[PDB]
Amino acid sequence: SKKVLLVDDSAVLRKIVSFNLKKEGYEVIEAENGQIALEKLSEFTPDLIVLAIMMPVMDGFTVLKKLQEKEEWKRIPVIVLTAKGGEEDESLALSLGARKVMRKPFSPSQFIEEVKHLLN
Amino acid sequence: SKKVLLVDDSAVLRKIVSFNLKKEGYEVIEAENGQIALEKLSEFTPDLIVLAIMMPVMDGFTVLKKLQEKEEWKRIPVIVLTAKGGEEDESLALSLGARKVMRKPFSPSQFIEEVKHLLN
Amino acid sequence: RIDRMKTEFIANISHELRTPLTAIKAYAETIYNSLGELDLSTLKEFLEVIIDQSNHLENLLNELLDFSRLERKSLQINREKVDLCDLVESAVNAIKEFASSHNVNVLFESNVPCPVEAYIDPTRIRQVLLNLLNNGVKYSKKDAPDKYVKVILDEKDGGVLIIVEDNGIGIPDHAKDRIFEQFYRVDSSLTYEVPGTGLGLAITKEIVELHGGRIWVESEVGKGSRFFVWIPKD
Amino acid sequence: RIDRMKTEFIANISHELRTPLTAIKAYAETIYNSLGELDLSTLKEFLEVIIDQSNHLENLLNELLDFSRLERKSLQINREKVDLCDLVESAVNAIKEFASSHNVNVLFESNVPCPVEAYIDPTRIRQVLLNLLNNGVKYSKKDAPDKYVKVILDEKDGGVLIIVEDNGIGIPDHAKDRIFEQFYRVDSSLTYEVPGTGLGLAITKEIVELHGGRIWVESEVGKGSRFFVWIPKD
Ligand SMILES: Nc1ncnc2c1ncn2[C@@H]1O[C@H](COP(=O)(O)OP(=O)(O)O)[C@@H](O)[C@H]1O
Ligand SMILES: Nc1ncnc2c1ncn2[C@@H]1O[C@H](COP(=O)(O)OP(=O)(O)O)[C@@H](O)[C@H]1O
C-alpha cells in the first residue's frame, strides 16, 4: 500500500533496506543517486523517502534543499540514513527539512519502527 | 580420533575453530594461554597444536620455544594461527619450529585443509 | 603528536580491528558451509556473535571519529540535570560482559547520598566512564582471583569528583605524564597483547575539559591506579 | 606527513570501514530476525554478502598494515622470474566485480608479444596493479557510457613499462606532485563521496622503489590519467 522511495548509491545497502521494507508490505522504488531520485518524482509521489548523503551526481543535502523548493515535493517526509553521524551533519539535515536522521551502522528493526512512526 | 590442542585467548575464536575441528571428528582440548597449554601436555599428547601468538601470561613465541626444549613435546606439529601476518613474524615462528603459519582473518575450510594435511 | 607514534598508531588500528573481523568472517563462512551441521540454537548463537563483534568494531570506529571531531573543534556539549548515580549504574551495566570475560568484578560506591543531580552532557560523560571502566578491565592483572574496577562518587570543591579505581598492573612514573597524550601506550611486557590505539584517554581528557573539568591519575606499578575526574556542578 | 592531514586521515579510515560494517551488521541482524521469512536462496545470498563485505574490510586493514610495515622499513620484497602478462590478467580478473559495480570496462594490451618474463616479486606487483586499477574505477567519470581502465604492457629502457590509463576525472596540475604523498587526497566536488585514506599511491611508490623502479603520472582534468610504472627487468 504505502510507497517508499529509497535513495542510496550502494546496491548492497538498497537490497537489505528493501528486504526489510517489503517484509512490512510497503512498495519500494530505488534510485542510485539524488538526481535519479528527483527524476522518479515525476512518475509518482512516495509516502516516504529514505535518503543517504554521500552520493555521486547529486548528494543528499542538495536533494533535501531541492525537495523544499517545490510545493508538490515539500511535504514528503524524509528519513536520512547516513554514515556521517556528526552533530553538525544532523543539524544541517534537519534544517534542510529532514524529519529524522539515523546513523549507519543501523539496526534494521529500529529503522523499521521509525518508518512506521512517520507513516502513521 | 585425533586430538587437537587449541591455544588462544579469545573464547569467541576457540569456539568457532573447535566447531570446525569437531565437524571433522577430532577431539579438542582448549587452553586460554600459553602456560595453561603447557600444563595440559602433562595430561596428554596432542596430535596437533593450534597456537595463537598474542596471549597474556605466556605468548605463543615462548610456547614454541619451550615446546622445542623437551623431547616428548618437540615433535608435536604446531600450526600458528595469528593476526600478526608480517613476514618477519612468520619467519620467527617457523624458526621457532612451527610447521605452518596461517593469518587471521582466515578461511575455516582452508584452515581445516591444512589441519588435515598435517594430521595425515 | 609525534611521527614515530603515528606509524605505531596505524599498525594498532589494524590489529585492534582485525580481531572482531576475524570472528565475523570465520562465523559467517562456517554458517554458510555448515547449514546442514548446525542446530537452531547454534545457528542463532553464531549469528549473535557476528552482530556482537560488529557492535564492538563499530565502537572502535566511533573512537577514531570522536577523536577527529575533537581535533576539529567541531564537537559540542548539551548539558542537562542528570542523576549521576543512575548514569554510573548504566555505564557499570554496559561493561559487565566485557568485565566478566576478563574475570573482573565491577563495583559502584557513592560517598554521598543519591541522587547526585549535576548539570552535564549525559552522552559524553557516559563515554568518559566507559573509557575508564574499559581501561580498568583491559589493564587488570593477568592472573589474580580478586580483580576489580570500582567507581566512587563524591561531591568536592564545588563539583563532583569521580574516581575510577582498579587493582590492575599500574602505570610507571615516567608514563603518568604521557598517558593522556595522543597515540601513547605505556609499552611493556604487561601491555603487549592488550589492544588499543592511545586515543581513549586523549578523548576523555578533551571531553572533561569541554565541561570545564579536569582529569588526573595516581598509580603504583604492581598495585593499581586511580583516575580522578572533577567536573563543575552548574 | 603533516598533522592536519592526520586529523583527516583518521576521519577517512572511520568512514571507509563504516560502509562494509553497515552491510555486515544489517544483513546479520536481518537474518537473525527473519529466519521464518527467509528462503534458502536468500539466506545464502545474505550470508555471501556478509562474507564479501568482510573480505573488503580485510583489504582495507591490509593497506593500513602494509603502510606501517613500509613506514617502519620492516617490509621486505622477495623476487622471482614472473610472466607479467599473466600477472596483469590475474589482476584484471580480481577487479572485474568492483569495476562492473561502477560500469567500468577493464582492458589489457601488450605492445609486445607474450610471454613477458620479468624478475619481480609477483605478490607486490599485483598489489601495485590492483591499487592503480582500483583507483581507475574509484575516480572514473560520474555518469558516462564508455568508462574504462586499461593496462598497457611494454618493455623500455632495459625494463618493463606498465601504463594504467583511464578516461576518468583526471587530476589538476597542483595535485600531480602531491598524489604520491602519504595521506594526500585531492579535495574537490568530484572526489567528495569517494572513500579512501590517501595511502594507496604512497604504498605503491615504496614498492616500486624497492624494486629499483619509479612511478609517475600524466593527467588532464576532465579527460583522464595515465600512471606509468617502470621496473628494471633485472
Ligand atoms: N587502568 C589502567 N591501568 C594501567 N594502565 C592504564 C590504565 N588506563 C590506561 N592505562 C595506560 O594508558 C595508556 C593510554 O590509555 P588509552 O588512552 O585508553 O589507550 P589504549 O587503551 O588504547 O592504549 C594505555 O596504553 C595504558 O598503557
Ligand atoms: N586514476 C585517478 N584519477 C583521478 N584521481 C586519482 C587517480 N588515482 C589517484 N587519484 C587521486 O590521487 C589521490 C591519492 O590516491 P591514493 O593514494 O590511491 O588514495 P585514495 O584513493 O585512498 O584517496 C586520490 O585521493 C585521488 O584524488
Query: How far does CA D59 lie from the centroid of its chain?
Result: 10
Distance CA C109, CA C163 (A): 10
- Grid coordinates representing C62 are 566511533
Tally the domains of chain A. 1
Q: What residues have CB less than 8 Å from C156, skipping those under 6 apart? A: C230
Distance CA D175, CA D165 (A): 18
CB atoms within 10 A of CB B74: 11
Closest CA to C67 of C228, C201, C214, C213: C201
Do residues B78 and B34 lie in contact, with contact meaning Cβ atoms separated by under 8 Å? no
CB atoms within 10 A of CB C107: 11
Q: Under DSSP, is residue C140 helix (H, G, I), strand (E, B) or coil?
A: coil
Do residues A29 and A3 lie in contact, with contact meaning Cβ atoms separated by under 8 Å? yes
Measured CA distances, D175 to D132, D179, D180, D203, D220 (Å): 17, 6, 9, 17, 11
Residue D50: phi and psi, rounded to 5, are -55, -45
Distance CA C229, CA C207 (A): 11
Distance CA B72, CA B45 (A): 8
Exposure class string for D192-206: b at 16+ Cβ within 10 A, else e: ebbbbbbbbbbbbbb
Which of B6, B20, B32, B62 to mutate against chain C (most C CBs within 10 Å)?
A: B20
Q: How far apart are the first and last CA of chain C?
A: 33
Structural domain boundaries, residue B96? 3-119
**β partners of residue D149:** D106, D166
Distance CA C150, CA C111 (A): 13
Residue A77, preceding peptide bond in cis (omega within 30° of 0): no
Distance CA B101, CA B85 (A): 8
Distance CA C64, CA C178 (A): 19
By the 10 Å C-beta count (0-12 exposed, 13-18 middle, 19+ buried), B55 is classed as: buried
| Alpha carbon of A74: minimum distance to chain C alpha carbons (Å) | 30
Q: At what angle do helices A60-68 and A87-95 cross, to 10 degrees?
A: 20
Exposure class string for A64-91: b at 16+ Cβ within 10 A, else e: bebbeeeeebeebbbbbbbbbbbeebbe
Q: Give D135 Cα–ligand 2 centroid separation in angstroms.
A: 6
Q: Give D179 Cα–ligand 2 centroid separation in angstroms.
A: 7
Distance CA B47, CA B21 (A): 13
Q: Which ligand is nearest to the CA of D138?
A: 2
Query: How far does CA C121 lie from the centroid of its chain?
Result: 18
Distance CA B97, CA B94 (A): 5
Distance CA B106, CA B82 (A): 9
Do residues B94 and B61 lie in contact, with contact meaning Cβ atoms separated by under 8 Å? no
By the 10 Å C-beta count (0-12 exposed, 13-18 middle, 19+ buried), D190 is classed as: middle
CA dihedral B86, C19, B80, C28 (to 10 degrees): -120
**β partners of residue B5:** B29, B49
Q: Classify residue D113 by its DSSP letter.
A: P
- Grid coordinates representing B37 are 597449554
- Grid coordinates representing A85 are 553521524
Distance CA B72, CA B90 (A): 25
Closest CA to A78 of A110, A117, A36, A48: A48
H/E run at residue D58:
helix D40-71
C-alpha count within 13 angstroms, C-beta hemisphere, residue D179: 20
Ordered domains of chain C (ranges, CATH) = 1-76 (1.10.287.130), 77-234 (3.30.565.10)
Q: Give the max Cα distance, chain A.
A: 35
Exposure class string for D126-141: b at 16+ Cβ within 10 A, else e: bbbbbbbbbbbbbbbb
Q: Cell 548509491, residue?
A: A9
This PDB structure is determined at a resolution in Å of 2.0
Put simply, whether B57 touches C (Cβ < 8 Å) is yes
Nearest residue in chain D measured CA to CA from C34: D44
Q: What residues have CB less than 8 Å from B8, skipping those under 6 apart? A: B14, B17, B32, B50, B51, B52, B55, B81
Distance CA D186, CA B115 (A): 47
Q: What residues have CB less than 8 Å from A117, skipping those under 6 apart? A: none
Which of D13, D24, D30, D190 to mutate against chain A (most A CBs within 10 Å)?
A: D30
Q: Whose CA is nearest to atom 13 of ligand 1?
A: C185
Do residues C119 and C81 lie in contact, with contact meaning Cβ atoms separated by under 8 Å? yes
Residue A113: phi and psi, rounded to 5, are -55, -45
| Residue from C183, C185, C227 whose mutation best tests the ligand 1 pocket (most atoms within 8 A of CB) | C185
Measured CA distances, A99 to A49, A53, A109, D101 (Å): 10, 14, 18, 31
Inspect the interface and report whether the beta carbons of A86 and C76 lie closer than 8 Å. Answer: no
Q: Classify residue C28 by its DSSP letter.
A: H
| Residue from D19, D135, D171 whose mutation best tests the ligand 2 pocket (most atoms within 8 A of CB) | D135
- Grid coordinates representing D119 are 624478475
Closest CA to D183 of D74, D71, D95: D71
Q: Under DSSP, is residue D202 helix (H, G, I), strand (E, B) or coil?
A: helix
Q: Classify residue C24 by its DSSP letter.
A: H
Nearest residue in chain C measured CA to CA from B35: C143
Q: What residues have CB less than 8 Å from B60, skipping those under 6 apart? A: B7, B34, B51, B52, B53, B54, B80, B82, B93
Cβ–ligand 2 distance for D197 under 6 Å, the answer yes
Measured CA distances, D145 to A9, D100, D102 (Å): 18, 12, 11
Distance CA C119, CA D107 (A): 63
Distance CA A85, CA D70 (A): 32
Experimental method used, please?
Answer: X-ray
Distance CA C139, CA B33 (A): 17
| Alpha carbon of C63: minimum distance to chain A alpha carbons (Å) | 13
Q: Which of B10, B83, B107 sits opposite C29 (nearest CB)?
A: B107
Q: What residues have CB less than 8 Å from D34, skipping those under 6 apart? A: A19, A23
Distance CA C119, CA C87 (A): 12
Distance CA D194, CA D39 (A): 35
**β partners of residue D159:** D232
Do residues C57 and D21 lie in contact, with contact meaning Cβ atoms separated by under 8 Å? yes
Closest CA to D40 of C22, C43, B18: C43
By the 10 Å C-beta count (0-12 exposed, 13-18 middle, 19+ buried), C36 is classed as: exposed
All partners of chain C with 3 or more CB pairs under 8 angstroms: A, B, D
Triad B111, B113, B118: Cα angle to 5°:
95
CB atoms within 10 A of CB A45: 12
Residue type, D173: D
Closest CA to C23 of D163, A33, B106: B106
- What one-character-per-residue DSSP string does B46-94 give? -SEEEE-S--SSS-HHHHHHHHHTSTTTTTS-EEEEES---HHHHHHHH
Pairing between β-strand D214-220 and β-strand D224-232 as defined by DSSP bridges = antiparallel
CB atoms within 10 A of CB C7: 18
Q: What residues have CB less than 8 Å from C66, skipping those under 6 apart? A: C75, C127, C203
Distance CA D65, CA B86 (A): 9
Q: Under DSSP, is residue C155 helix (H, G, I), strand (E, B) or coil?
A: strand
Answer positive or negative: Cα dihedral of B108, B112, B114, B118.
positive
Do residues C29 and D73 lie in contact, with contact meaning Cβ atoms separated by under 8 Å? no
| Residue from D138, D178, D184, D228 whose mutation best tests the ligand 2 pocket (most atoms within 8 A of CB) | D138
CB atoms within 10 A of CB B47: 17
Please give the number of the atom of ligand 1 that sits closest to the Cα of C166: 1
Strands (E), C73-194: 80-83, 105-110, 117-120, 148-156, 159-166
Q: Give D185 Cα–ligand 2 centroid separation in angstroms.
A: 6
Q: At what angle do helices D3-33 and D40-71 cross, to 10 degrees?
A: 160
Q: What residues have CB less than 8 Å from B118, skipping those under 6 apart? A: B48, B77, B79, B99, B100
Do residues D139 and D104 lie in contact, with contact meaning Cβ atoms separated by under 8 Å? no
Q: Under DSSP, is residue A113 helix (H, G, I), strand (E, B) or coil?
A: helix
Cβ–ligand 2 distance for D159 under 6 Å, the answer no
| Residue A15's CATH number | 3.40.50.2300
